[PDB]
């Protein structure tokens, strides 16, 4: 009972799994070998003499970034075929990942996910982590959704995307892999959390005050997002929320399932002890329209739903007071078909302290998974890049060369066009 399976694909998937499974290891007390010196059931198992194997698949067509966990300390933690690798990288090619070289590794991925689901006595969700900006994260990741939605139909599939940033790309064919991979995260995904790298850069710049953060520091905060997300699945609290209730009291009409993340007790030790990080101040920094983890301003969008996950020494009287002061402000606005728009959930477990990383010791936390119509702009910015490139048929010989017909470019743009059209239609 109470198991969730994380499914990492793409190189950013392995690295985000190195931080997330790290945090799950501390948050139940597992040593680096896999031994505690049953809250752990969602993430780890019990293999006899205290062994604790994680419930993950690390999936990549390029062996290099999955080899560093196979050669570091945690070959002995992860089961050695739960780290499925390949030979050639998909190489920023959605065609290569989805049609050509992803169709030989997809057998080992589905076989291992099946074995990781047979030892479950009631499974809540599939927390798939990926990055839609490249090759195997856009390709094989999409195909894995096609196979998962047909063998596990009733199963909910959460998905933490890493959607392309506006001015920062680190890839020039990235607009092609983003637009062409919308259909996996529109019809075969029940929760689509949209993250991008720049918003984590800004949070690290002004809140944590690391001026020059690395991707490993970006994986700090996204690890804190899933810990507060699966907080009620593992430790007791005043109000509990499971992944069935995230996708019920937050998700409107079924195509609109695109949510945004905002953790906000982000602070480091030079600031931390000078201020009261109580319930009122951490939730005002949560609704602040510069701490969104999307580079997507909510001040031109309407909040359709919000999910506050307070986590620590938080009293429910202060939660109901904090939702009052955020409801009385005009800069925060809601759709008319929403008298109640908050699913508050409290976990008694304090936020896990970060020795040697970037955060500090805080007694309470908050994370928002909020669906708004502001998210109709993270795809409009990528429309302009797609239409500019596909006007001159740029970069499309690489796609058509492995068996990706030129047709799919047009109705992937058209599918995102109906996605945009669906978003201002709700906000009328």
């Amino acid at each position: 009972m109470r198991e969730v399976i994380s499914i990492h694909v793409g190189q950013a998937g392995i690295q985000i799994g190195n931080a997330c499974w790290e945090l799950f290891c501390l948050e139940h007390g597992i040593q680096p070998d896999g031994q505690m010196p049953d809250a752990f059931n969602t993430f780890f198992s019990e293999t006899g003499a205290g062994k604790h194997v994680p419930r993950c698949v690390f999936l990549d067509l390029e062996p290099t970034v999955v080899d560093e966990v196979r050669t570091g300390t945690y070959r002995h933690l992860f089961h050695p075929e739960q780290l499925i690798s390949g030979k050639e990288d998909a190489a920023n090619n959605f065609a290569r990942g989805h049609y050509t070289i992803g169709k030989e590794i997809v057998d080992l991925s589905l076989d291992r996910i099946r074995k990781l689901a047979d030892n479950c006595t009631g499974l809540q969700g599939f927390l798939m982590f990926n990055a839609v900006g490249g090759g195997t994260g856009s390709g094989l990741g999409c195909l894995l959704l096609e196979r998962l939605s047909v063998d596990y139909g009733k199963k909910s599939k959460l998905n933490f995307c890493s959607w392309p940033s506006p001015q920062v790309s680190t890839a020039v064919v990235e607009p092609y892999n983003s637009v062409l991979s919308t259909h996996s995260l529109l019809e075969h995904t029940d929760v689509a959390v949209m993250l991008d790298n720049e918003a984590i850069y800004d949070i690290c710049r002004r809140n944590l005050d690391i001026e020059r953060p690395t991707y490993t520091n970006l994986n700090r905060l996204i690890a804190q997002v899933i810990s507060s997300l699966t907080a009620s699945l593992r430790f007791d609290g005043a109000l509990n929320v499971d992944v069935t209730e995230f996708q019920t009291n937050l998700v409107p009409y079924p195509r609109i399932h695109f949510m945004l993340s905002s953790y906000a007790p982000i602070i480091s030790a030079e600031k931390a002890y000078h201020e009261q990080l109580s319930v009122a101040e951490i939730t005002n920094s949560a609704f602040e329209p510069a701490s969104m983890m999307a580079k997507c301003d909510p001040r031109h969008g309407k909040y359709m739903a919000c999910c506050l996950m307070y986590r620590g020494d938080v009293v429910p009287k202060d939660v109901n007071a904090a939702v009052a002061t955020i409801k009385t402000k005009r800069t925060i606005q809601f759709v008319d078909w929403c008298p109640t728009g908050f699913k508050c959930g409290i976990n008694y477990q304090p936020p896990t302290v970060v020795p040697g990383g970037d955060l500090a010791k805080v007694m309470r936390a908050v994370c928002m998974i909020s669906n708004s119509t502001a998210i109709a702009e993270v795809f409009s910015r990528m429309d302009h890049k797609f239409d500019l490139m596909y006007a001159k048929r740029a970069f499309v010989h690489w796609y058509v060369g492995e068996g990706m017909e030129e047709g799919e470019f047009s109705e992937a743009r058209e599918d995102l066009a109906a996605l945009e059209k669906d978003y201002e239609e709700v906000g009328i």
């Binding site: 945090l23 896990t352 990383g357």
Partner: protein, 48 residues
């Protein structure tokens, strides 16, 4: 009358003698820079 004795030595007989061989003994001795020891000290042990 005497005989004027033939003094004469051609180009091919005069103007080269065996030179000393060039003194060459010098390899490119390169001191290897030692491999800079690696701590991009990883995630698990780094923060938790």
């Amino acid at each position: 009358p005497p005989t004027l004795p033939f003094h004469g030595e051609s180009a091919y007989r005069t103007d080269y003698v065996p030179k000393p061989l060039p003194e060459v003994a010098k390899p490119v001795e390169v001191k290897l820079p030692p491999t800079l020891p690696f701590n991009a000290q990883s995630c698990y042990r780094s923060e938790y």
